[PDB]
Amino acid sequence: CGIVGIAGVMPVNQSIYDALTVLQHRGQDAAGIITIDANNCFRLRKANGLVSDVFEARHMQRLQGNMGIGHVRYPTAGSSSASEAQPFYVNSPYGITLAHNGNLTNAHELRKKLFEEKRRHINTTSDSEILLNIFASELDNFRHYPLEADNIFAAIAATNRLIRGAYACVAMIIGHGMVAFRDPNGIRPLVLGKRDIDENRTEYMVASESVALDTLGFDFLRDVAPGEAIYITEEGQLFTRQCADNPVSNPCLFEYVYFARPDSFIDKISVYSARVNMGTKLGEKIAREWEDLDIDVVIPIPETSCDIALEIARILGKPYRQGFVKNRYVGRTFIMPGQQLRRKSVRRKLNANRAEFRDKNVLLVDDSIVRGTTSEQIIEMAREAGAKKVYLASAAPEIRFPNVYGIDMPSATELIAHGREVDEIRQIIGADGLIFQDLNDLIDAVRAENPDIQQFECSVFNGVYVTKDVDQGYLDFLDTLRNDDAKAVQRQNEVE
Amino acid sequence: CGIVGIAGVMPVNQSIYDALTVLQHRGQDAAGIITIDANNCFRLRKANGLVSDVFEARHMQRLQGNMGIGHVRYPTAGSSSASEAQPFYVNSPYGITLAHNGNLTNAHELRKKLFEEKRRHINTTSDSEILLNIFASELDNFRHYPLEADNIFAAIAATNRLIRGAYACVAMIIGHGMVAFRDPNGIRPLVLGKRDIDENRTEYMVASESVALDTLGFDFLRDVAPGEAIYITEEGQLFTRQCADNPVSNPCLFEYVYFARPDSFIDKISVYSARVNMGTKLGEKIAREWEDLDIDVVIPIPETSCDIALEIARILGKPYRQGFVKNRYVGRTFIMPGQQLRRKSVRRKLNANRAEFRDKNVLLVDDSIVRGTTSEQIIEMAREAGAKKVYLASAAPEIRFPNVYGIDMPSATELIAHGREVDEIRQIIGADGLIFQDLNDLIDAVRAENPDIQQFECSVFNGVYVTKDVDQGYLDFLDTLRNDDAKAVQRQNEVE
Amino acid sequence: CGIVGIAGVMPVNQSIYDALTVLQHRGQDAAGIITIDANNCFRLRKANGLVSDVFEARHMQRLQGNMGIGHVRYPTAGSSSASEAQPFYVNSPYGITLAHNGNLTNAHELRKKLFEEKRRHINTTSDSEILLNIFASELDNFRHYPLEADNIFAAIAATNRLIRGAYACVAMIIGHGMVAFRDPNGIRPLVLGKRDIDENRTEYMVASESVALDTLGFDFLRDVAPGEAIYITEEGQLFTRQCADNPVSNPCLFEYVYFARPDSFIDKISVYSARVNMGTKLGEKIAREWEDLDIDVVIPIPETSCDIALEIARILGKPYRQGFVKNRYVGRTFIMPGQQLRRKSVRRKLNANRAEFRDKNVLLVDDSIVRGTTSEQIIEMAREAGAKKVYLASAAPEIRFPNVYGIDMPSATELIAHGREVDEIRQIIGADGLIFQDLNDLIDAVRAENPDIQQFECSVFNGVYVTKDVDQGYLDFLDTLRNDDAKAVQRQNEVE
Amino acid sequence: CGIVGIAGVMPVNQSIYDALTVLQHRGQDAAGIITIDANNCFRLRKANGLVSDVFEARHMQRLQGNMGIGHVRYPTAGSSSASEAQPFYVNSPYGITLAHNGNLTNAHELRKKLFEEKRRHINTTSDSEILLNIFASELDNFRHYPLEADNIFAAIAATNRLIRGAYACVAMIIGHGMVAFRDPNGIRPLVLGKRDIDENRTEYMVASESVALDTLGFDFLRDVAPGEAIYITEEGQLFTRQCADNPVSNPCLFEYVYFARPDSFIDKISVYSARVNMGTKLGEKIAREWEDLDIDVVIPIPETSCDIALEIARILGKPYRQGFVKNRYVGRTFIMPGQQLRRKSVRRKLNANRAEFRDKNVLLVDDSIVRGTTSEQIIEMAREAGAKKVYLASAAPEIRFPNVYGIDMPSATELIAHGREVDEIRQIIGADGLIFQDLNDLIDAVRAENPDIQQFECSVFNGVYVTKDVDQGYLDFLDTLRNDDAKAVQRQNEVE
Ligand SMILES: Nc1ncnc2c1ncn2[C@@H]1O[C@H](COP(=O)(O)OP(=O)(O)O)[C@@H](OP(=O)(O)OP(=O)(O)O)[C@H]1O
Ligand SMILES: [Mg+2]
Ligand SMILES: [Mg+2]
Ligand SMILES: [Mg+2]
Ligand SMILES: [Mg+2]
């Protein structure tokens, strides 16, 4: 998921729209924009689909005001395609809306506590609504009006004490302004920017990645610190505060591997440079451990791995060639009566340049291996194109554990690397050779760009969950949400 | 506006849809249906347009559950075409949704009190949202769970003490059931019905008119009494209570004149029979006061006045003839560039049977006269068809005051009868003769069908407002809402 | 179906739209408008649904020009809801478009001749496309340019020699103007009008009924004569010609019974006056043959029969009362899985005023009886409302044969009156008494308004087909078209 | 534009849809699919937008049959976004549909001849409709039925004698089969394929590029020869014929520079290999003529030029870096009243990685330079990102003349290179250095992959038009089409 918040001095609807379009890679299932208009009323538009589909002209005239937030959704457990999208809002106290990228590992406990202690009903299975109501709950304790910046930060600190997990948040409070905060482990990305209009008026904005600042012409200020809260008033004043105890920087490693855009700077690390480094480490590991193998060419599985594969081919002194081409437009397969629905995917997504594989030992480079069924089909494509020996290299280490911090991933039993050594995986997907990035090499590659980062969020690779509340009972709660997600999507399909 | 609530034992989405389609005459601007599904979650669909336009197949699969309410909107001050429609809902306490037909005369005072005392933000200008939050406010005072029927009735009584005006309401409370109540003056119509499925399970429903019960096969029980509250639990148990002090039955007279359907029974009065009576009284007044006039034929302005005109023609011993035909489908006029937009309305709505007017002194019968510009154009049509003397009779008395109890009407300065005697109106609209129903005759005609009714709501005719809080300052508040309503509709038109 | 053609001197898009809206009662399945723009290019918009749904703003800007035709479709065999709508057009010779109300009884033979002799492919099962191509064929024989009025009339005469059946047509020929013609039996309605703009420029139009002329402010000239052709040039000149031998006036009787609007004048006969006369004749027949029966009240099945029942009640000296109310809005029934829909199919269209039936012997009046399942269910409603004896009277004679002249009707085996006497029908539908208009009385009632009309098209009542080419082979051709139409409609819902 | 034709033995709707999605890069303005169903009837769906927007489920059930063609449109003169899209069809003779990629340079003369000699009206400004009608004309000369393969080839040969320009075409003839042909200069790309189902049944298809064959699993046979015609019968038989005299292979050079996909093989030339060769030639020219310049890094303007810049960086022994990232999703800019849009038009498409430009002399590589305003703004981005000296290299030679063979380009007066030397252009766009590919080097690079190709279509670079009918009169005809196209597009937004 991706989030945007613009506290400006002129209409922000188009800017939020433009900022979401450059974060569209963080989620293409749904989109939502909400603004505070001249009467201090939320104005909202959200629906399923791409940003360019969700917001028509008639919806943009509705989104009046100089302050607003936006959200694009990646389908996760609890926030399915058939579900209501973000942002949510409650009308008491004062009026609050919130957009969220991440996941709360104690969502179930929080929902119970909200109902019993506050009689606050949660109408969806999205943990973002829960986070919103916790925050609204803590804000309701203050009776005097208006709230002071210290009240709002106090409410944010109380929230960080109650909730566990990973979250980058932006929110608005009618009559006050815009806030943004980050989990105490700094897992999910969030950056702050500004744009000076004159010596009196300055606009601010936050976003999941710096590219959203670049595209609008905002000067980059800094990443929002772990546990830090940003508050920008309706007049245009910026306040900050540390709202967590023992904050630490444990940025998500997956952001650098493939999820974030290469032209972004997350916690002072160029995603592009990090990915080039990954290819250096992986190319070095390959030259060391596959010295005896005959590799004719290095070919990337586009698009994420093109720069990584270029560096590997350099380390190995081997040619780089564009053997696979990814179609920019995919298109849907229709549920067809009296027509065969036996087509296998991946042929839509990718195509093979037949001349680049014929009678060659090829080294394919992909960003990661999850289920392996996709990887199998890519290797099959190479063989059908004429490749003899087909070797596969993964920019990421083996993916053995589910992510519970905002990155949608299948359960452990669906991960091919779960409970298997490398050779088993190789034999299953049909490769002649298979190699994975060493986790220490991946850490070094990203850590090289910012040595201040001591540890990263590596749960999917090593099973170490930094929040320390991931047990089998919690994993079962998520599999329940996924069961209900499938039933809601299925019922929509029948009705169409 | 019209409302429906069905507390059933099997899915209610289609029933609510079908019930709204037979109440569509109470408002064609927007529609909304909301249900409580098997997970005790509100499921909602609302938008602008007709019932048959708003609810597609994909929206009806979303509306799962055995309990729900529906609403169709007539555009009023505060609830414009460009606005968010009903029903609204809040997620605290417990979860409440409400649909409303009427108007709160102290909406401004209530909005202030809600913000200061409860920090409850009202995001729209609809008084229905205000009514919802007052009710939610009183429900939040109870901390123990679950609420008892006496808690809910206590909250309704507290609400009736705070709010003033006219309202028929239906609402749901997650985890409890469905409630419905009526203003202490019984101004807005509301009836209760049931449908027995077996000796253990009975379904209940409420609606603005009895035709909604008829069309679904529900047995009519009774009108909801003035100030009375109905409560139906999730198990299927019915409770009632008087929730107002000094309740009285002052049913709206306009419902009988034209707004309600003729096959409905409102407060034990057949709307059809009431309208026939109106023609008897008006035919008697005409024979008395226009003895010397030469009337060739009685012609109704369809559709409401066909039965009224039939009775007048009978009293006068004169022929009845269908001189005007109303087109069932109207269609829109497009804002056209390089095309003349000088067309006058009424020709779309009505057409004249040329042979029924030629060389005749015609007595036209309409249900009421409001602005008079429409009436002028109807008289003009008759003359263009060949009529010599054109006389006009109004089933309703002169309309001199605005309605503030839920019937959308223009301000007093826009009412032709405001500050004018009959002959002035006649001279302005271009009639050779003009006559109005005497208010006492109208009361007798409706009161004849149920002599228990001592007084009716007659504010638009005599300026007597039964709630006793209609001053010039309140009339100014409504003209502000209408100013903002026009600006919102205008901005939508520009953007299309 | 209904048709409109406007040969004007200023944009006609809105005029055609407005004229179709008052002809919408002739078909609500699809609508189409096509104009000739300033570059002599057809500009088209057609789709399924009502006029008000089909034509958005974006389509009306496309419909530029001062000449155009329109069509609204009633679902028939070969042109189902799932099919391509009217108007059709071919781009050779010159460019021709046509709209048509009626039916060709030799459609199969014509399609064959078109394929073998002219290699003209007919892409749909609509007989209108065939009619367009026959006319286009005859127009291609003339080689010199431009065509002269006599050329076009010659082509129309040649077409009338080839095609058999009933048809009212309007068409345009690029570079020439607009034509309109009528079948040699004058079965389908068509009227001509004009509107003077100044001493130099006059606009003309044609339409199925005179109400389309009235609503746009066109002066009625006359019905287009049987077999006559009208031609209106781009300059604004009117020419005519008799283009059939042995033209005769056998106007469709159903137009007067229920299909046309009451304020229309078809062949100088007021539909309204004709229907009152029908009620006079039937009231006279009822009093004679049911002298001994006890009738409490006369109640019409709305809407067509309200005036007919009023006249019957007058002849019988009995009260008239609105016992049935037709629901103005119907709405769709959604295909629902695992869901009981217990609304009755008769309750969809009608509702019963319970107080008007209870403990009375009622005489229901309907316009006609076709399948009888509907009549059965309406009689059932009356009994459930409290009626004791329920008698039924049909404004039309028994319907025993299918209509092949443009009025959609089921086959003879589906008509309850087919091969049955009156009393058998009575026993099947559950009436205590059943009586039909005598065909001779129906002719008298319509003939009274214009004795010049000697005979009418009465095939559905007596089986006399004036075209004399209705054999078993044509009936099988129609049941084949109905079979394929159902499979196409089924496939749309399958995929929806 | 791009075209597809599938003559199969099982439903082709999804296959055509899938093939257009991998040809979507050839035109994103409109899309169209038409099939011949079991009753030998054209079944069509076309509209504006992307393939994934144009074809819903309801349209794919309509597209029944085992034979069909498809088209995706690039906006050109005469077929603007606001215009009717391809494919077109006529219903005489027999029924013919056609899809076309290219442009007819004698369109005006052809429209005249069609009107006078054949009275065939052309309803749009698309030259494809003209091409369809010429072919239909020649097919009508044959009177006996069925047509024989030699008849159809005779009609194609006659058409090639009449029409001038560049064209790749696919078409269907009801009752016969599918045809495809290529202009006598082999300018526009077209390839043929097959797919064996069993020893009895083989499917065939044609398409603009080989990637459409690959993605569906069709074996590549060969490019359709210049002037050659392909005919595939409904039974599954392949015939061919040379249908032009003096056919020659002058393939479009732009296809290789940027327009075609890199994994395609056009006339036995890999687009990917050709582009690498272009970069080799340009890198060699740069090292020779810019020996003395200080270049820090080579940066491509994505996406077409990434591989070209990679090869340049290799020749120069300099680092390659992803300095520019192309935004995958662009989104629309809404016409906003009273609202400042301060996003820059270059920022819409591209974003700059600030760290890759700061304090470096950068060599930007783009595929071509047309207007120069874009290049100016990209150079400006580099400087704002921190670049010192910014040098620009164009993979294509200077573009001085308009393309009249199917590639949309502005007129010569809008081309910055028109009437200017290299250094003047450099001064205007703001580069510190500017260099272009030598046309002779470009020919060598493409010619290396297939020396059998002696000459290419190079009109845009050198003004040599191989058709020899590009005069000032045709250029005025095109600027007229562009004028009317703009007025139609303007009128759509006015009314939206
Ligand atoms: N001259 C013209 N220039 C530009 N665009 C034109 C056009 N003539 C037609 N179109 C468009 O192209 C489609 C034609 O298909 P039809 O609607 O007639 O038929 P269908 O295939 O059975 O659905 C339509 O778009 P749409 O995406 O189906 O959406 P709307 O039905 O909501 O409108 C129409 O808007
Ligand atoms: Mg929607
Ligand atoms: Mg919507
Ligand atoms: Mg459409
Ligand atoms: Mg459309």
Side-chain angles (χ1 to χ4, degrees), chain B residues 8 44 57 65 94 125 131 136 139 153 236 260 265 275 295 318 340-341 345 357 402 415 441 449 468:
Chain B
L44 169 69
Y94 306 117
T125 54
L131 210 173
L139 279 172
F153 293 127
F265 289 78
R275 291 183 185 166
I295 295 152
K318 295 286 181 168
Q340 181 62 247
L341 282 182
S345 53
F357 294 89
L415 306 172
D441 286 345
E449 300 290 319
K468 297 173 50 176

Side-chain angles (χ1 to χ4, degrees), chain C residues 446-458:
Chain C
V446 181
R447 186 178 174 279
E449 303 291 319
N450 179 15
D452 284 16
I453 302 297
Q454 287 292 109
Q455 299 194 19
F456 300 88
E457 201 291 291
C458 324

